[PDB]
Design a protein around this ligand. Structure first.
Ligand SMILES: C[C@@H]1O[C@H](O)[C@@H](O)[C@H](O)[C@@H]1O
Ligand SMILES: C[C@@H]1O[C@H](O)[C@@H](O)[C@H](O)[C@@H]1O
Ligand SMILES: C[C@@H]1O[C@H](O)[C@@H](O)[C@H](O)[C@@H]1O
Ligand SMILES: C[C@@H]1O[C@H](O)[C@@H](O)[C@H](O)[C@@H]1O
Ligand SMILES: C[C@@H]1O[C@H](O)[C@@H](O)[C@H](O)[C@@H]1O
Ligand SMILES: C[C@@H]1O[C@H](O)[C@@H](O)[C@H](O)[C@@H]1O
Ligand SMILES: C[C@@H]1O[C@H](O)[C@@H](O)[C@H](O)[C@@H]1O
Ligand SMILES: C[C@@H]1O[C@H](O)[C@@H](O)[C@H](O)[C@@H]1O
Ligand SMILES: C[C@@H]1O[C@H](O)[C@@H](O)[C@H](O)[C@@H]1O
Ligand SMILES: C[C@@H]1O[C@H](O)[C@@H](O)[C@H](O)[C@@H]1O
Ligand SMILES: [K+]
Ligand SMILES: [K+]
Ligand SMILES: [K+]
Ligand SMILES: [K+]
Ligand SMILES: [K+]
Lengths: 140, 139, 140, 140, 140, 142, 140, 140, 140, 140
């Protein structure tokens, strides 16, 4: 269609539309157990996470009513911090969100919040530890 | 159809009809997480709540055997009391329903009750904290 | 519910509502092969057709845009003209459609039309050749 | 069909047939939350309960292996004790069942039992507190 | 249940009641391609046809409005006239139906009609050419 | 969501999205046989068609590869020409579509084309002969 | 089919086959509540248990890794220990199983174990307390 | 299970059982468009055709009412004659079936007969032109 | 996974594997009516056709039993020959296919063949007339 | 398809692909209760476990983030150590994985683990105690 971001599947848009204030969506990397965890699965194997996050932030406001609307997955000790978080931070600040609302959950904590999320979008993102949890806010 | 309100959808009327004494129905605003909470989902994305409440009250009696047959979602203290509540109130009293039956639920409590409800209709009501739970009476 | 005839079921009211101008519904007697002809089946095995026709006529205008809004199934020339037709004619008139709209269809014509109808209603009408096809009109 | 009562529906018969020793079936009045409680829902919106109870008892024996094979719904004070109970009792004896088998569950207890029942039939019964639960017996 | 013949399964009785006037049902021996022909399939692999025929004709009237209300499968010329046809005739007479109504179809016509019937019941009947096609009549 | 017309329901947007070039969609009025004709049914019982037409024209280009990308349902005499057709014509021109693309179908023909359409949306439009068929055009990268 | 007991239905064979070591299948008499207890239901309404048990014991080895691979339903006083238990033991002995493997479960314990069984088959066995639970062993 | 050939899956045996006189099942090599042509699809991707032909010939009698019970795919007039046909012919006379019942179809005719067949089993057979159509006969 | 091209969704791979000789798959551009035309629909809204074509040709042989294993959609009138046709041509040669196997279909004929294809994959390819139909060959 | 192990079924490949880091898959022997334990069942009745394990190890890396990514079912000792274990070890070491990751689970613990596995693949492995639980690692 005209005016809608080009990297959003028909089904993704529907689920973004039907999501209400408080509903969470996981943007999972190519390595995340998306199918096994998901309440509702959306497959987007041909899309990396930076470009997808940008489009969703364009469309979907974030929950200001909580302290933490965005969550990443904290690494296991010995593993390196993915540099991709810098792209996320750069993007998140872009659509005028305060970077303070990001918090870090550990692997098992993350796995569990994704199960309670309304949908997981399986991406093709190769970067390790690239999983993002987004919480929908109120629409103006 | 003749003699039936024009803003009650086919599927909404079916579900109102099959509802029994005690069953609850949520009238959710545009911002409510309707789809994620619904046991049974009706979308009326083009209808506003006062208008839909009016039609529902005409058709469906409210539960006399409980202290509270109506619930709103309570605001965070001490934020502004939603203006539309007045509209609702003036319509609830009118169908002959005592205002002292309305009750206010914490966001979390409201969510939990909506999951146990028979159905949630998702409306286009743009106003905040505009949600309502209704409990069916006897006919 | 209030203001809605007590002899119209949840599913029947839904289908009456979603019917539009021209759609046909079949009030079928107990002997009619409703299930095998039905595009969409609605069972009301405890209801008779007089009651039902009355309630339906109350909510749903007939099709003014054709010669025939109503069709009974004809007998096999001409053994015992069914008494129940008389009861139908009384209601159909003073509701208030013109009795001249009723045409009578051959068995195999009726069967065939009933398959092209939107829905059939299986009733408990024990009378013979008691079936009816009604055509929805324009609501204004 | 011949030799089968005319007011029990196709899916109703299959249901009574497939029930076995110990299974319960609720015959619910027009005000019961049948749809929302039913494990399995049979709709008979045109039928009243006394005629239905008569047909079922004809086909289905009641459980002798428990002290209560029938339950009614008790009134909340101050509602009227419905007259229909008298019709029910009069009809339950006359099939030969000892009226001592009838017990009286309060509203909330009744709902919870109907939930663990194999099937609920939503009737057209207008009388209040006209709900019945029947427990299937042994055949031989 | 009480008053229902013991060899009519729950789903068979249902389909028998769902059937209207003119509807056909095929009683298929254990060599018939039941599953591949059936619009709707009922399996009674442990039942033989003559006893099934008895119960069905007991419960269901035959179509007395057409030339043939019953069809068997004619043998491929040469092969023996199956004995069971005798047993069927002594079954059909009794229940008061005239054997003049039995017509005989050839394999590829018997297959064709069975596809258009409302149901095929697959039985355990080991005898050859034991297939019967039944047409439902009026219930009064 | 932001930047999306607020009268386009979640399922309608999906179906507008999954439509490609040549696909058609029917905006059916309240009296229309939407449910019986529909390959794929979307119910928007609370929406009027001019509102919906503006939002759809905003997002979805019309098919330039055919003469008629828009069809109305012609009247039988003596029904009146509906006023809403002006409203539609006003709307269509202004999104940049030549009114020459509008053609008119006999009630009967309209029904049959609606059965071959990708989707019918049932609206709350009480105005008569208010049905439209729109045929999706190519979306070209700027 | 050749070389396959005639009294095993298409769907029963498949269930027996997809059962692994330790899975249980219940052979239920005509009075049992099979439909309501079953995780997976197979209907063999025209077959008695004796015949069926023989075929199943011909095809399916019994679990030798537990104390008891066969459970009958024990009676409640004062009912009679049914004669069919005699018929069961050889077949059972006759297929080579040590009868000490038969353990007896009371009514409620039987229903609960059957709810946990991979499948229940509803038979036509009019005899009482004829239900049997079988536990599949290892093949070679 | 005991007394069942070991290379027939649970679903294959069921489909082999529910087939009746005249039904056709296709044994398709790894390269055959099984998924697209199948009315009913059974997958046996780890199984070669000769051993499957063995078991099926053992369990399933072939149709004697036709001159041709078996169809191979004939080669494209350019391609080479497959070794596997000799295997097949030897397999076919071993059970008492005359090789004169074998016929050969050109791809087009083969594709079409397969669509009209009750089932296609997609096998792992590597040999080209390895496909077989078997038509079931009567069990006595 | 290791060794599988990174831009193939789990479902596309399945589709590719279950396709056999002669089956056709349509790589559809972002303007194609993919959903209304597809018998089986795989969405890859995040992939462009060149990268998809490349990894598909790696896995899947083309049908050499026909003059044309590849079909493009010829432009109307009218507009330019898209440059991506050069890109496809450079890839098709290199994987070892004779470019003469490419034929060009009029818009309506392409649509019609795609209705007959096993599957259509909806890509995010923004180039016009970028659609490709591939026919599967034999393997190894 | 080319470059893909020949013993991986279309849905198995899909399953392996849709699995993510941490997801488990049971390779279950012919005696295992796959059907009854399986959250998601893939049937591969024709295939043995070593050839299948080998192919899967080629495609799927094992989880490095736990102390044990491979589990066998331990013997009831009771029975003796099955020789199929060494064959497994020869394989998993040949794929670069350290044999100190194999743990051993008791029969009941293995059943429970398998219920919580993403998929169970039912094999034709005739070796006893031959079941394997693989846990998927990260792909770099
Ligand atoms: C160790 C982590 O496992 C998770 O499942 C993945 O989603 C992360 O990228 C990372 O590999
Ligand atoms: C803050 C509240 O969030 C809720 O989910 C909404 O339903 C209310 O309208 C309000 O926006
Ligand atoms: C002869 C007629 O057949 C029809 O199917 C029935 O609906 C009528 O009642 C009558 O029996
Ligand atoms: C108070 C009681 O509520 C129940 O649900 C109904 O079944 C009774 O008839 C009565 O209305
Ligand atoms: C030759 C005939 O084929 C039919 O399909 C069977 O139903 C008959 O019993 C007979 O065997
Ligand atoms: C007479 C016409 O019937 C059609 O079905 C409707 O869609 C038109 O709006 C009008 O009412
Ligand atoms: C009392 C027992 O009830 C059980 O459900 C039945 O299976 C027995 O046959 C017996 O009637
Ligand atoms: C050329 C032939 O194509 C067919 O589809 C396949 O089934 C044969 O094995 C062979 O490859
Ligand atoms: C005119 C053509 O229509 C087709 O459906 C599209 O796939 C092409 O890219 C082009 O736009
Ligand atoms: C005793 C064990 O039981 C399990 O179910 C099987 O999977 C093993 O192979 C073995 O037979
Ligand atoms: K996708
Ligand atoms: K809606
Ligand atoms: K009903
Ligand atoms: K059966
Ligand atoms: K398989």
């Amino acid at each position: 269609l005209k005016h809608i971001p080009k990297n959003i599947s028909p089904d993704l848009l529907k689920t973004l539309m039907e999501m209400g204030h408080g509903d969470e969506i996981v943007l999972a990397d190519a390595n995340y157990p998306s199918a096994s965890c998901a309440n509702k699965l959306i497959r987007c194997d041909g899309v990396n996470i930076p470009e997808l996050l940008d489009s969703i932030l364009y469309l979907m406001p974030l929950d200001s009513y909580v302290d933490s609307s965005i969550q990443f997955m904290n690494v296991v000790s010995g593993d390196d911090i993915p540099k991709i978080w810098g792209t996320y931070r750069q993007m998140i600040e872009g659509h005028g969100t305060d970077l303070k609302t990001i918090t870090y959950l550990r692997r098992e904590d993350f796995y569990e919040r994704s199960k309670k999320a309304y949908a997981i979008v399986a991406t093709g993102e190769t970067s390790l530890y690239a999983n993002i949890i987004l919480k929908k806010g109120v629409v103006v």
